[PDB]
Symmetry: C2
Subunit: 54 residues, 2 copies
């Protein structure tokens, strides 16, 4: 199971602080850095689930 | 290491962002941040079956 802890909810309130004062350029570079990171995360997971089975 | 399908999605993503409003670019940056944490939780789980 996986869902947001207390402190991560805190982290979400902080990112929201810093995003609201972001320029169009900064929000776009970071979002792209985030989307790429999301895919590299799927790969760590997939690779971890395989490595457990076998 | 992005697979071949992922590199491709990236390109589609560079093309969407570049057209995004400052408004959507923010909403979505948050969502992606939530997701990264959710995925980090999943990764932490699977690593915990380190119970051996």
């Amino acid at each position: 199971l996986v869902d947001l802890s207390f402190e991560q909810e805190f982290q979400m309130r902080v990112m929201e602080e810093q995003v609201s004062a972001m320029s169009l350029q900064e929000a776009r570079e970071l979002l792209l850095q985030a989307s790429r990171l999301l895919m590299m995360k799927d790969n760590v997971i997939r690779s971890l689930v395989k490595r457990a089975a076998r």
